[PDB]
Design a protein around this ligand. Sequence first.
Ligand SMILES: O=C(O)[C@@H]1CCC[C@H]1c1ccc2ncsc2c1
Length: 166
Amino acid sequence: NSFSGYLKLTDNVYIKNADIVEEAKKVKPTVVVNAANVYLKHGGGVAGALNKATNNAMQVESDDYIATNGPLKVGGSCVLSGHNLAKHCLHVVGPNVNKGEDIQLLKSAYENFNQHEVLLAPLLSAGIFGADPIHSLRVCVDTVRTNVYLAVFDKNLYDKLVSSFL
Ligand SMILES: O=C(O)[C@@H]1CCC[C@H]1c1ccc2ncsc2c1
């Protein structure tokens, strides 16, 4: 495939210090993962950045999805358009520790990735979702069996994740 400059962590997990919006514009992957909430309200974090890069088309599509189907579950997902960034966007809901959600749901959230042969993704439940990113990377490698390319935006976080990976 066309992903370049990634560090191989395992047989199927790769990682790079990159902005997932810029990686998606360059690669045009079949699937880009969004770090969504149950309402698909893409205000901040990686969801806000991806939505802004679509000129708000992601949010307009998402509002129609919620009006028809109701909210997602924590640990769940839905497949929507990738707009100008990818063929599809897999919106995955990891638990948000800052909302008091159970971190135990993180493994269920990563299991959604196994439905897609290859994905470009951020770390679930990290950043403003409040979980320990070292734990999120461990759950990712121990749960996902398909090929995942993780784009870590924060440079200091990337360096910490590499140096502490077992
Ligand atoms: O990799 C990170 O530093 C965090 C961890 C969890 C969400 C990631 C994130 C956040 C915002 C953002 N904006 C553009 S790419 C991008 C990616």
